[PDB]
Enzyme design. Sequence first.
Site, PDB file in Angstrom:
ATOM      1  N   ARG A 508       0.819  -1.185   0.000  1.00  0.00           N
ATOM      2  CA  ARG A 508       0.000   0.000   0.000  1.00  0.00           C
ATOM      3  C   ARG A 508       0.858   1.242   0.000  1.00  0.00           C
ATOM      4  O   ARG A 508       1.899   1.271   0.654  1.00  0.00           O
ATOM      5  CB  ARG A 508      -0.830   0.026   1.272  1.00  0.00           C
ATOM      6  CG  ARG A 508      -2.038  -0.846   1.261  1.00  0.00           C
ATOM      7  CD  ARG A 508      -2.862  -0.662   2.566  1.00  0.00           C
ATOM      8  NE  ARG A 508      -3.470  -1.932   2.938  1.00  0.00           N
ATOM      9  CZ  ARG A 508      -4.735  -2.282   2.721  1.00  0.00           C
ATOM     10  NH1 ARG A 508      -5.635  -1.453   2.164  1.00  0.00           N
ATOM     11  NH2 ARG A 508      -5.120  -3.473   3.110  1.00  0.00           N
ATOM     12  N   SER A 564       9.122  -4.816   5.514  1.00  0.00           N
ATOM     13  CA  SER A 564       9.027  -5.881   6.498  1.00  0.00           C
ATOM     14  C   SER A 564       9.988  -7.037   6.213  1.00  0.00           C
ATOM     15  O   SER A 564       9.553  -8.163   5.996  1.00  0.00           O
ATOM     16  CB  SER A 564       7.580  -6.332   6.601  1.00  0.00           C
ATOM     17  OG  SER A 564       6.961  -6.377   5.336  1.00  0.00           O
ATOM     18  N   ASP A 615       7.605  -4.006   9.876  1.00  0.00           N
ATOM     19  CA  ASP A 615       6.181  -3.994  10.194  1.00  0.00           C
ATOM     20  C   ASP A 615       5.933  -4.138  11.697  1.00  0.00           C
ATOM     21  O   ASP A 615       4.989  -3.547  12.220  1.00  0.00           O
ATOM     22  CB  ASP A 615       5.382  -5.025   9.400  1.00  0.00           C
ATOM     23  CG  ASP A 615       6.032  -6.344   9.345  1.00  0.00           C
ATOM     24  OD1 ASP A 615       7.128  -6.483   9.860  1.00  0.00           O
ATOM     25  OD2 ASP A 615       5.455  -7.242   8.734  1.00  0.00           O
TER      26      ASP A 615
HETATM   27  O1  LIG Z   1       1.658 -10.772   5.974  1.00  0.00           O
HETATM   28  P1  LIG Z   1       0.306 -10.173   6.236  1.00  0.00           P
HETATM   29  O2  LIG Z   1      -0.745 -11.208   6.418  1.00  0.00           O
HETATM   30  O3  LIG Z   1      -0.278  -9.312   5.030  1.00  0.00           O
HETATM   31  O4  LIG Z   1       0.279  -9.437   7.628  1.00  0.00           O
HETATM   32  C1  LIG Z   1       1.365  -8.638   8.061  1.00  0.00           C
HETATM   33  C2  LIG Z   1       1.216  -7.230   7.460  1.00  0.00           C
HETATM   34  O5  LIG Z   1      -0.027  -6.804   7.966  1.00  0.00           O
HETATM   35  C3  LIG Z   1      -0.442  -5.545   7.539  1.00  0.00           C
HETATM   36  O6  LIG Z   1      -1.603  -5.415   8.303  1.00  0.00           O
HETATM   37  C4  LIG Z   1       0.549  -4.480   8.004  1.00  0.00           C
HETATM   38  O7  LIG Z   1       0.082  -3.184   7.572  1.00  0.00           O
HETATM   39  C5  LIG Z   1       1.949  -4.816   7.430  1.00  0.00           C
HETATM   40  O8  LIG Z   1       2.987  -3.903   7.858  1.00  0.00           O
HETATM   41  C6  LIG Z   1       2.347  -6.246   7.800  1.00  0.00           C
HETATM   42  O9  LIG Z   1       3.490  -6.552   6.999  1.00  0.00           O
HETATM   43  O1  LIG Z   2       5.950  -9.744   8.019  1.00  0.00           O
HETATM   44  C1  LIG Z   2       6.469 -10.028   9.306  1.00  0.00           C
HETATM   45  C2  LIG Z   2       7.943 -10.528   9.258  1.00  0.00           C
HETATM   46  O2  LIG Z   2       8.174 -11.282   8.081  1.00  0.00           O
HETATM   47  C3  LIG Z   2       9.487 -11.747   7.895  1.00  0.00           C
HETATM   48  O3  LIG Z   2       9.804 -12.675   8.901  1.00  0.00           O
HETATM   49  C4  LIG Z   2      10.479 -10.603   7.960  1.00  0.00           C
HETATM   50  O4  LIG Z   2      11.771 -11.145   8.057  1.00  0.00           O
HETATM   51  C5  LIG Z   2      10.275  -9.790   9.194  1.00  0.00           C
HETATM   52  O5  LIG Z   2      11.134  -8.670   9.164  1.00  0.00           O
HETATM   53  C6  LIG Z   2       8.827  -9.336   9.284  1.00  0.00           C
HETATM   54  O6  LIG Z   2       8.632  -8.638  10.499  1.00  0.00           O
END
Ligand SMILES: O=P(O)(O)OC[C@H]1O[C@@H](O)[C@H](O)[C@@H](O)[C@@H]1O
Ligand SMILES: OC[C@H]1O[C@H](O)[C@H](O)[C@@H](O)[C@@H]1O
Lengths: 871, 867
Positions: A508, A564, A615
């Site tokens: 996003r 992340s 994240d």
């Molecule tokens: O990997 P997923 O399921 O999309 O959840 C983790 C992510 O969730 C989202 O809700 C966050 O805004 C992100 O920063 C995060 O990386």
């Molecule tokens: O998306 C959540 C996590 O995913 C992966 O493990 C990334 O290495 C880590 O940095 C992140 O916080």
Amino acid sequence: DQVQKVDQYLYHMRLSDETLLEISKRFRKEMEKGLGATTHPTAAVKMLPTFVRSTPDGTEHGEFLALDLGGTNFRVLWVKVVEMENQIYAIPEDIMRGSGTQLFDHIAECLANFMDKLQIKDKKLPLGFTFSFPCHQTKLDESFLVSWTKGFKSSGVEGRDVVALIRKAIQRRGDFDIDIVAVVNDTVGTMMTCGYDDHNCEIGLIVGTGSNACYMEEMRHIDMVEGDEGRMCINMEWGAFGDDGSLNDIRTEFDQEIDMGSLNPGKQLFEKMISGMYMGELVRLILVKMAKEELLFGGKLSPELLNTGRFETKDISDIEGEKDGIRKAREVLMRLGLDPTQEDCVATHRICQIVSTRSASLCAATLAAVLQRIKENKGEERLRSTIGVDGSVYKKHPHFAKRLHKTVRRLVPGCDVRFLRSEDGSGKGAAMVTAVAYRLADQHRARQKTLEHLQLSHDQLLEVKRRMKVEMERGLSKETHASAPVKMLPTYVCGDFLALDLGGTNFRVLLVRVRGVEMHNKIYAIPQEVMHGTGDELFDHIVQCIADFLEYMGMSLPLGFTFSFPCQQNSLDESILLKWTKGFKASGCEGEDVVTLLKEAIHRRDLDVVAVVNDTVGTMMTCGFEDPHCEVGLIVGTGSNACYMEEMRNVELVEGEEGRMCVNMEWGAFGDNGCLDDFRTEFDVAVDELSLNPGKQRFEKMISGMYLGEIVRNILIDFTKRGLLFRGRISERLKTRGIFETKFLSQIESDCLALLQVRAILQHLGLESTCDDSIIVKEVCTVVARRAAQLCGAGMAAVVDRIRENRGLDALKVTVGVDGTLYKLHPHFAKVMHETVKDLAPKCDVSFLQSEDGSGKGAALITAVACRIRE
Amino acid sequence: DQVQKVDQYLYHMRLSDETLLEISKRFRKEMEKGLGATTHPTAAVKMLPTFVRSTPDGTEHGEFLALDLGGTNFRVLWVKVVEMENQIYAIPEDIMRGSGTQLFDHIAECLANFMDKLQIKDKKLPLGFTFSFPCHQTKLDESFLVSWTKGFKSSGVEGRDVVALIRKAIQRRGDFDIDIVAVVNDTVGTMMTCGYDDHNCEIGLIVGTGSNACYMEEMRHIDMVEGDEGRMCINMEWGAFGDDGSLNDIRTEFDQEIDMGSLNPGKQLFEKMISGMYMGELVRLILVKMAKEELLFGGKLSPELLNTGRFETKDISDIEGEDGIRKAREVLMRLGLDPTQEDCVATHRICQIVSTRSASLCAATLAAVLQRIKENKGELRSTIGVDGSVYKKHPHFAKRLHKTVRRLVPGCDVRFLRSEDGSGKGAAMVTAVAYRLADQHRARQKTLEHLQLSHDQLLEVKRRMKVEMERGLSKETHASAPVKMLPTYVCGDFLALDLGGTNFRVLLVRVVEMHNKIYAIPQEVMHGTGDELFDHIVQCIADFLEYMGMKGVSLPLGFTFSFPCQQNSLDESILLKWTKGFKASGCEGEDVVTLLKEAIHRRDVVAVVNDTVGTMMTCGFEDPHCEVGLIVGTGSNACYMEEMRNVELVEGEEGRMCVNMEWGAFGDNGCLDDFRTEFDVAVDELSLNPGKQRFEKMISGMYLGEIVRNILIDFTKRGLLFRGRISERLKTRGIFETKFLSQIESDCLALLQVRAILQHLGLESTCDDSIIVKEVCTVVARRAAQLCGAGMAAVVDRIRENRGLDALKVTVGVDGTLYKLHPHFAKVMHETVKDLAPKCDVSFLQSEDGSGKGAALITAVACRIRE
Ligand SMILES: O=P(O)(O)OC[C@H]1O[C@@H](O)[C@H](O)[C@@H](O)[C@@H]1O
Ligand SMILES: OC[C@H]1O[C@H](O)[C@H](O)[C@@H](O)[C@@H]1O
Ligand SMILES: O=P(O)(O)OC[C@H]1O[C@@H](O)[C@H](O)[C@@H](O)[C@@H]1O
Ligand SMILES: O=P(O)(O)OC[C@H]1O[C@@H](O)[C@H](O)[C@@H](O)[C@@H]1O
Ligand SMILES: O=P(O)(O)OC[C@H]1O[C@@H](O)[C@H](O)[C@@H](O)[C@@H]1O
Ligand SMILES: OC[C@H]1O[C@H](O)[C@H](O)[C@@H](O)[C@@H]1O
Ligand SMILES: OC[C@H]1O[C@H](O)[C@H](O)[C@@H](O)[C@@H]1O
Ligand SMILES: OC[C@H]1O[C@H](O)[C@H](O)[C@@H](O)[C@@H]1O
């Protein structure tokens, strides 16, 4: 002469095809009523499930004990798969009508007797128990007596499980022991003995002391057993047909009186018209009445003729079968203390015929309804079916069988039907059924022996928590950081804004207006191409997205970048990518500083990239905006990871021993050094070795949404190739990666669901599964997700007790901000983990706040903090 | 002729009847997926029950508040039955998207304010809450938000009961209160406001901020609600049609981009192609792509055009409805563009195509709704209730729809009825019904409270028994006593008789081996004369000996005679009164041994015993501690071993004698009339023995069903059951037999099964009727069990006090078809005895062999006396 006046006397016991066909139409209606979920409790014909789903395969092997109880001879047998041995044992009428305890005491003593005799008293064998009474069972290895019938009446068995009563009897001795007990009705056992020789045997028929029949019905018509696939044997308990009055126009005064004299009055009224326990007396009562009326014996009656039970069904058989049939009639009547006349003797012979011809014709009626049903089930223009039969009347009456065979074949002329006579008795078919009960019992045990490796005890989880703790120290100490799996990375976290959220399910770009917080965003897809390609293409695309969003938004702003992945941050705005994780594999990015890459890519096309955060850190800040106490970030989504506020004294990689800094643990790599290999299974190894980053992210690979499905899938696949699931064939679509996605794992384990419902979802995923395959798959998932929840919980336990020990506190109040699609879709993960933390970190009061605004809000807030700092 | 260049570019957005027909076949499949129990969980179209079974009735009346929420205008209303008054209140964008608490306080405030406006703040009124979102509900007066849709996103509301949330909001005020709250989707409210005008209204449609429809479906097809009688309105939530990708070959790239920029990505995919929140933005995304490909505006793109939400749905409406092309110019110009007359032609056509696909998409799903209603009925004259900005305001949407749909379903007479009052009217109507149901339930409960007895009440029944027990045992008071405490004179091969239970038996008892035969006692004999009855009895005895192969042999006989008898000795017992259903003439007041002997003469009676007494002995044969007898069958009675010094009617103070209490007559002096209800009075007064056996009539199997039936009749005629229809079968004595009372109350039965049992009895019942019937039976059998416990508690404490013990361990021998068939009676009595008689450790032993065994054993101990 005499013949033709008996026929006028007993006109209503002489049944036309017209009334026989009417009787079978009624019976049919009673079959449906008995099978329906909602009408079944009001049904006279109970149509009892038996959980026998097929005649023998031929794959049955083993050594078995058996019991045969309810017919004229109680028998203990031994069977090998066929070699058989048996012995008949007497049950005294006082035990037959004594206490259950007594009854089963006796059975167990007889059984012991027999084992000694054969010299197997020390073997622990499975047991095929033929119990010829109506039973409620939800599986082969139980049966709850519904009601005694015939000449049994033991207190305290009805409503109880005969497998438990017999075990309890055996264990009152100590003499010996038995393995699994499978219980079948005699009709079922007889079907199975006969279908052993002709696998097309679909009906089981008994005409003996009582009468009953089972048949193989389509599972879609059996409402009382969840499932619609294939067939299952239904013990109809047809002897109770008419117990509601449905045959009162067929029953006579003589049947009414047999009933008044019976041990089970009101009950088993159809049976009372047919079976061998009743037939002789029916004929005694017809004689007595005719003699009181002065139509036989010139109105004279001996007291033996008046004495109940004196005219036997053996005598009906003998009278109708001896070559001198008139002379045999005379021989019986004289044992009854009469001197009959050739005329009297012709009447007596003729009553025997009338009585036993009706017995055969009543069975024909109901048998004709069952064959018609089976014809409709197979769909076929005329039908082919095998009925397997036992019982003293069918076997020993000289004509019954013939009349039955004839009457039926006429009542259903669009049927081809073979009657097979059982030579070995029910014990054989009962051994065949126990073959399967045992097999199923064994496969189950084998499945849970595998799943036991994925179940962790309180103590294993205290140990996982401890290990996490020493790995946290390892990565925090600069002396050992380079060699540490859990890196514990300094984050350097101690108006209108832009935000990026990269590395979860959606990328996003966001506008975060702070004043409270107003947030906008758009999701931008990243094509497989760009995602697999070069750093330049990825960041080119990222920038193209930012540009589009600014137009979309009707708008240069400061930027918080949520990225992340594990990054070395030398400051808030210099972040070097250590390695990609999850599914990212773009070239020319690792070992580079992503801000540079972003800036370079913006030049090509400017903006104010102030901060880069994980994240976990963004989510912690989103959540801590609502709550002073939020000091920890947790992600359980595509990957899993956690950050928390460490003390600067402990953050040795950053000079300063005062204040605090957020530490991005990158805990997914917990176990990359080997420190969890005793908790890892062959399935965890398979998920790892077949991944993009083999030997890496091992903890996360046991926890997160990207990987669980694959733990499950590798398990399901192992089970099927060991013959324990999916009939042992590996669908080329189970060979297929990533089918078990977080949505279809969180659904499968929802406990507002029933089993066909769960079966719906597996069906819906394109795996063809029976209700049995589906309880397995559901347990395999429950298990994999429970372990994930609990490992995550043990990791977190480590984190909270660390913060608490770092502050010397005796107790800690703390919130953990949380996000990720697994955490928020899955029915139990959230609670199992919160529970796990509660148990493993007693001196901590942890509250988990689910993030509703994503990491981009908290990223906006550290940028806003960084901005005000530099002004 | 841009018009044709537009059509070929926006080709996948112009829907032929071939692809509308497919859409509708698909939707029908999704309808069946969502209604089906096994497939519902994973159905994209949820087909949610609303618990509205009917359009208005004319029977609705009251003063309701109402809230209307989730459309363009949040409204608070006041409805009286129709008088209406309302006020719109803004919900800010940060509140709509803030927290649950905050959203609800605001609704609570605006409510409070509206009440001040109308001055009606002191009042506690019921409230109809139109809440325009998917909600799970199992009654009208709850709704758990499944998901926010459209522009809403308050935290902490999904999963919660919006009625609970609104209640916490109002009490955090203290400012005011409300009564019962019923919640309806706005389709349901809109179906219901039009249904007030036209009672043939069977669909409710909304095309406005979002789109959704509801319809009246046959309960037999709603697997998700237990029942098949009648119909129920189903809130389809069709906005989510396609969410599983089932419409991905219809959906275009613009629909995809709308979804990526939406507040609820991946959800309401069908809605996002239709409704007003999305149609303007849809048209803007088509203009923005065309411009970028240098197909319009010479590829010159303004920031306004690129800005989200600048092309409104009002702009589509205005353009299509005013010189189409001068209005488009004016709008495009406001968006900072410099349009040619050809650009203005495209824009206007784009608007048409997008607003016409909208109407057509609705027609297609609505087609399927109507086909389904057609099949249900068997023929189609339906009214559809409608509302929402796009339908109301847009110039051609309605007509496009009426045309597309009347064309799509040809065999149909479908009046579309526009709603002018909004959902609130119809939501007050539904609330009228919720209130009513609450009221009817409250009346029913209030009635049954009269059959529920506290621990203390039961101690009082125990006490009162204790005093009647003393009263009857004493010679100074025994002639006055209703509880008679009758001395029984109980302290080889035999005959026995068993008379007065469900079955008359003659027995041969070999001392234990037992044989018996049942003999019927026809109505002729039952209500005949003493002579005919005993003649019958002797004919059967004579039959039995033959049957047992000992014709005319004279055996010593034990006569179990289940009626109150004055026993002057073991072999002299004078029938005091018939009870239960016996009524033979010239028997009461006579010695039944003499009447037996006489009838024998017309063609060795050692002993006459009550059934309690024979059962005491049948059971004591195997348990030394059995000194009490209990019967709960056709009637109820107990006997027990008393101290001869307590038995004043028999001279002697040494030893013990069994006393047949005849406890069924407890209360015949008026001593339970405070515990006796109008339905007990009715059962008594239409009995053969009015004024007699009043305790028994609250306990035993011949009567319990008559009390039930009487309660059901009273409920029915009061409008509280069976639709106030007194089924003729309901007027038939004796239908609630003991086997049925027992079955109905089983913990195994699902409710459709309970219902099935009742239709077998011959009573037409809804599942809701069955809920009530089961409860009435449950309350009556529970009282019965408990009164029996209060009674037995007296008896056992008495045996203790009599022996100056501080702890008694004692067995009771029990028989009777109610005791042994009913799932909870046994347990509930044992419990009650435990609670009311704590110093006694009471075991209850169920007789397996009938009274005849005990009666024969007494006889054998008699035959011993005289030797
Ligand atoms: O990997 P997923 O399921 O999309 O959840 C983790 C992510 O969730 C989202 O809700 C966050 O805004 C992100 O920063 C995060 O990386
Ligand atoms: O998306 C959540 C996590 O995913 C992966 O493990 C990334 O290495 C880590 O940095 C992140 O916080
Ligand atoms: O009552 P009968 O004549 O013994 O016939 C029925 C019995 O027949 C035997 O052959 C079977 O082994 C039993 O399982 C069955 O109950
Ligand atoms: O979202 P819109 O355009 O206001 O249309 C639907 C609304 O229309 C109103 O008239 C109804 O009273 C509401 O209950 C409903 O929500
Ligand atoms: O009235 P019911 O249900 O048949 O039960 C009571 C009767 O039960 C019989 O079993 C007893 O032998 C009778 O003596 C007794 O009167
Ligand atoms: O033994 C033959 C039959 O006898 C009676 O009908 C039993 O109730 C039944 O279970 C059995 O199949
Ligand atoms: O307001 C019209 C419709 O909007 C959305 O689709 C809601 O989910 C639905 O409940 C409502 O009926
Ligand atoms: O059958 C049980 C009881 O029924 C009636 O109450 C009779 O009065 C009583 O004699 C009997 O014991």
